[PDB]
Design a protein around this ligand. Sequence first.
Ligand SMILES: OC[C@H]1O[C@H](O[C@@H]2C=CO[C@H](CO)[C@H]2O)[C@@H](O)[C@@H](O)[C@@H]1O
Length: 347
Amino acid sequence: LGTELDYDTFCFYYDWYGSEAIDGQYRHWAHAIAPDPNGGSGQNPGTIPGTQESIASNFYPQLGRYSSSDPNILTKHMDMFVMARTGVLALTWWNEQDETEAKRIGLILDAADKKKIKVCFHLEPYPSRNVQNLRENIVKLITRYGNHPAFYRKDGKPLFFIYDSYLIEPSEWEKLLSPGGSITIRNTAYDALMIGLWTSSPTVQRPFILNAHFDGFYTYFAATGFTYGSTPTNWVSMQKWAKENGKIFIPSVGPGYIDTRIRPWNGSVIRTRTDGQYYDAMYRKAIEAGVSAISITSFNEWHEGSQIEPAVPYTSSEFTYLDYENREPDYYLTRTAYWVGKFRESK
Ligand SMILES: OC[C@H]1O[C@H](O[C@@H]2C=CO[C@H](CO)[C@H]2O)[C@@H](O)[C@@H](O)[C@@H]1O
């Protein structure tokens, strides 16, 4: 029918939003404003309070200030994934070691399964992250969730995205990811496809990826040109290198970028949506590069303005939000479905 989910399409999902009613605070809708790293001492940037009028986004959710723990929101999000044809939800994972995290992960897996969506984890730069506690956490996640019907596998293997994987030296990664490594997961019950973050130039990244024994790489950033990896004119050559070296390249595409409510000094990174033309251009470059898998930044990173989740026009007494302009609130979901179809036609 040309409507089915694609299980080589990964959409980055954030479960960090809270409401007073469910979570005790409007978590993440309220957010600290970052000081300017070049703006000197004594800055008092303040906070966005997460009121109805003033939330930590330049856009405004159709679903309002929702809780990521609300089963009825999760249902709606899974229906949005179905509309977008995105078969894998790539869940932010911060190693919070708290019961409210555990509850949310279970709720997300359960809701996903009702719609045949799969879930993988996006391993974030949590405090003192290192290859030993990464192994322990991979073991825990596979043990806890590996028998859940929504747990993602590719040819029998789980898959993890590793954000800011450059914060760990290749000599450490080798211990976890080489078949001969001291604490290897290879050939164990806990083996997985490990997808590292390609940032800078090939001269740095090629030996990093090889020496670290990653199975593949992704680029994350929705803003074109932010890094070498997030410059789509490099994707043909990145894919050629991946194929030559038996690596999986999963370029990240997004619909735009703007984070100036939380980072007012970061205007140079703004990428305008132009009624969908930015998203179209980026998605076309990924498909044209001949890749096997694509990642989408993001479902709902509202702070960074990369979301495809529906947004509505809103002007409050405190802020005039951006909105999808000439496009309807669900445009980025249905445009994702269009591109998934083009990707499948190519695959
Ligand atoms: O956008 C604010 C957000 O920024 C950091 O999180 C990263 C932002 C986007 O994606 C990556 C990969 O998922 C995240 O690690 C972090 O400082 C958050 O605390 C903050 O809310």
